[PDB]
Design a protein around this nucleic acid. Structure first.
Ligand SMILES: Nc1ncnc2c1ncn2[C@@H]1O[C@H](CSCC[C@H](N)C(=O)O)[C@@H](O)[C@H]1O
Length: 327
DNA sequence: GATAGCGCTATC
DNA sequence: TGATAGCGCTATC
């Protein structure tokens, strides 16, 4: 993450829905805002959230009386992405886990926060011939909110990871917010190799397999792209190896494969998966962040987390727009 | 709950 | 196209 000195969000209060690891919290908190509520049903997710913030999130959002939610100014939610990701059976709203947005909508209707800040996968945009995005657009407008959305890739914001997500910022119609903008991209100066751990700490993640085929050769030049080097087995998800000289492929939560959830990387002549801490780093988490004790749950957690640095920039801008009230 | 081999879609 | 990436799905212990 980065340091912000013009804490544009100082007096505001926010809600951390689908908290997970708290990526949103870290993000807004660094801009001066204060988290007044958190929600997360996963036992293991609750444990890390507590380890790091001292709070234990409330349970299943579905059975929560919206009125019970504290007055808040910003609503943060990176709702479930399985039903929309290019990686699954795209059942969308028909999927048992595709309706959460509507819960967001009921919370919005009742609480009327100044800002709604959501995050989802890139395919959310194209899904069902854009009909899903549309339902989300109209619903929002209908509740009296402007709807701004853009697909941003983390590699354009200082993090060596290809993670194209769609960000939806909605402003209550009152405040004539006509000056909001998404952060301007910038050259990538940090690559995977820069975030790795000393070999001593990683020895146990090394995986030597015989069906390890090598398609391309290691590169000499650093590049802001996922340069694949090899494949293992049939080369499906989790069995593809990348160069630590490019950028990390997207980390996943339920991903399988021998290089389960992080993909594999050629580190100093050896083939291995990323260590939880490295995932944290690749998501822009500070090294002070305490990872969950079960590596399986740590990988899952980071798999569906959010790239902090990006949210920071966006949060800052959200701040700037709200603070421009000239005479 | 932890592990891993899958088989499909979007994108150009 | 033909080759790549994808906050995944699901069967086994
Ligand atoms: N009905 C529900 N109630 C509460 N939390 C829920 C839920 N359905 C899914 N979740 C939680 O939704 C989360 C989505 S992942 C989003 C993670 C968050 N942005 C962070 O930065 O890490 C998961 O933790 C999942 O357990």
């Amino acid at each position: 993450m980065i340091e912000i000195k013009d804490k544009q969000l100082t007096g505001l209060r926010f809600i951390d829905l689908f908290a997970g690891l708290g990526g949103f919290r870290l993000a807004l908190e660094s801009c001066g805002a204060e988290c007044v509520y958190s929600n997360e049903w996963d036992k293991y997710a609750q444990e890390v959230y507590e380890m790091n913030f001292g709070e234990k999130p409330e349970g299943d959002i579905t059975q929560v009386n919206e009125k019970t939610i504290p007055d808040h100014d910003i609503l943060c939610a990176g709702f479930p992405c399985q039903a929309f990701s290019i990686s699954g059976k795209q059942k969308g709203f028909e999927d048992s886990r595709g309706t959460l947005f509507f819960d967001i909508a009921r919370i919005v209707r009742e609480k009327k926060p100044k800002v709604v800040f959501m995050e989802n996968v890139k395919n959310f945009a194209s899904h069902d011939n854009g009909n899903t995005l549309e339902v989300v657009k109209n619903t929002m407008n209908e509740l009296d909110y402007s709807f701004h959305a853009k697909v941003l890739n983390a590699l354009d914001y200082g993090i060596p990871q290809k993670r194209e997500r769609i960000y939806m910022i909605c402003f209550r119609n009152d405040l004539n917010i006509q000056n909001f903008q998404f952060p301007k991209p910038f050259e990538l100066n940090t690559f995977v190799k820069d975030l790795l751990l000393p070999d001593s700490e990683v020895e146990h993640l090394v995986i030597d397999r015989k069906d390890l085929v090598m398609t391309n050769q290691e590169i000499e030049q650093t590049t802001p792209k996922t340069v694949r080097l090899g494949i293992v087995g049939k080369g499906g998800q989790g069995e593809r190896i990348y160069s630590t000289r490019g950028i990390a492929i997207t980390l996943s939560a339920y991903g399988g494969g021998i290089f389960a959830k992080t993909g594999g990387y050629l580190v100093n002549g050896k083939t291995r998966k990323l260590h939880p801490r490295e995932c944290a780093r690749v998501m822009g988490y500070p090294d002070s962040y305490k990872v969950h004790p079960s590596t399986s749950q740590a990988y899952k957690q980071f798999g569906n987390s959010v790239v902090i640095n990006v949210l920071q920039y966006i949060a800052y801008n959200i701040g700037s727009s709200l603070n421009f009230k000239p005479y």
